[PDB]
């Protein structure tokens, strides 16, 4: 069920949830996938992560207009790297309210990214403070601790068995933890397990750069990360 639209792919995961996929040519790697989510909540649409670029992100909004034809209320981004935040200006151009971890907004300018308009803060138990994430509805946002990056956040969709760990979680067949340049190797394993414990009923774990996987993706990530302590 891959639906093509311009240079992006959309896959329905649940009645009100789609995966968006965009591609960037990376030296030595070919055309690399980056995934995010689109959630319909009543008369509005919510987006998790931008595409790699503004032009790709504008495509996501065009697909939404064509397939759903409801306004995009807000977008949240999972960390300050090009794959998840590279299209922030396309959301601003569209008048969409944007949210990121406060640390993601602090890091974004130096990473050559546009900061979100709103900063998220987190309770002691990792769950987003609702006063910083107003109107999020079925989007449940969780800071699991540092891993792929210090700012990485994760999201579950209430009324579904879907959770998304962004770049924190690797696929169950991965041979690498990937980008360790900005990673917290001492805390990585605990952060991966904290994500699994936050969404214990999630059976469909959306991957950052590959097709959806099982909870084995969380287990495999944490076991690889245990090796770096
Ligand atoms: C090279 N590179 C980069 O320079 C940057 C990314 C983005 P992030 O650090 O994963 O946020 C990247 C993402 C995926 C990726 N591939 C996945 C399968 C093979 C390589 C490469 C990436
Ligand atoms: C190899 N690899 C991979 O196999 C996978 C990733 C993506 P993730 O970090 O696991 O989400 C990846 C990301 C960045 C990267 N490098 C950036 C500079 C050189 C390579 C490599 C990655
Ligand atoms: Zn990243
Ligand atoms: Zn990644």
| Domains defined along the chain, listed by start | 2-227 (3.60.15.10)
Resolution to 1 decimal, in Å?
1.7
- Residue 45: φ, ψ to 5°: -120, 140
> For residue 34, what are the β-bridge partners?
22
Q: Is 130 left (phi over 0), alpha (psi -120 to 50) or beta?
A: alpha
User: Taking the alpha carbons of 72, 76, 78, 82 in that order, is the dihedral positive or negative?
Assistant: positive
Q: Are strands 162-164 and 17-26 parallel, antiparallel or unpaired?
A: unpaired
The rounded Å distance from CA 200 to ligand 1 centre is: 27
Ligand 4 midpoint to CA 36 (Å): 11
Please state, in angstroms and as integers, the Cα–Cα distance from residue 93 to each residue in 51, 54, 71, 151, following that order: 15, 10, 14, 25
- The reply, when asked if residue 151 is annotated as ligand binding, is no
Q: How far apart are the first and last CA of the chain?
A: 40
Is 148 assigned a ligand-binding role in the annotation? Answer: yes
Q: What is the DSSP string of the chain?
A: -EEEETTEEEEEEETTEEEEEEEEEETTTEEEEEEEEEEEETTEEEEES--SSHHHHHHHHHHHHHHT-S-EEEEEESSSSHHHHTTHHHHHHTT-EEEEEHHHHHHTTTTTPPPPSEEE-B-TTSBBPGGGSTT-TTEEEE---SSSSSS--EEEETTSSEEE-GGGSPPTT-S-----TT--TTTHHHHHHHHHHHSTT--EEE-SSSS-B-THHHHHHHHHHHTT-
Angle CA 99–103–107, to nearest 5: 100
Calculate ∠ Cα 205-207-212, nearest 5°. 60
The minimum-distance atom of ligand 1 relative to the CA of 208 is 10
Tokens, residue 22 = 């965009």
Substitution site in 49, 178, 205, 218 for ligand 2 pocket (most atoms within 8 Å of beta carbon): 178
Alpha carbons within 13 angstroms on the beta-carbon side of residue 19 total 24
Closest CA to ligand 1's atom 4: 26
Q: Give the position, in ligand 1's atom list, of the atom nearest the Cα of 84.
A: 11
Q: Best substitution site from 28, 164, 179, 206 to test ligand 2's pocket, by max atoms within 8 Å of Cβ?
A: 179
């Amino acid at each position: 069920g891959d639906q093509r639209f311009g240079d992006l792919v959309f896959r329905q995961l649940a009645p009100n949830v789609w995966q968006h996929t965009s591609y960037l040519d990376m030296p030595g790697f070919g055309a690399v996938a980056s995934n995010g989510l689109i959630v319909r909540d009543g008369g509005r649409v919510l987006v998790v992560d931008t595409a790699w670029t503004d032009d790709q992100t504008a495509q996501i909004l065009n697909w939404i207009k064509q397939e759903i034809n409801l306004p995009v209320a807000l977008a949240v981004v999972t960390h300050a790297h090009q794959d998840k935040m590279g299209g922030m200006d396309a959301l601003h151009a569209a008048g969409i309210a944007t949210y990121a971890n406060a640390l993601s907004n602090q890091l974004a300018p130096q990473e050559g990214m546009v900061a979100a308009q709103h900063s998220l803060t987190f309770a002691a138990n990792g769950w987003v403070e609702p006063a910083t994430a107003p109107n999020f509805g079925p989007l449940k946002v969780f800071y699991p601790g540092p891993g792929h990056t210090s700012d990485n956040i994760t999201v579950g969709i209430d009324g579904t068995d879907i959770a998304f760990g962004g770049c924190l979680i690797k696929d169950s067949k991965a041979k690498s933890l990937g980008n360790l340049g900005d990673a917290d190797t001492e805390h990585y394993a605990a952060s991966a397990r904290a994500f699994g414990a936050a969404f214990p009923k999630a059976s469909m774990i959306v991957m950052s750069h590959s097709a959806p996987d099982s909870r084995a993706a969380i287990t495999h990530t944490a076991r690889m990360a245990d090796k770096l302590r």
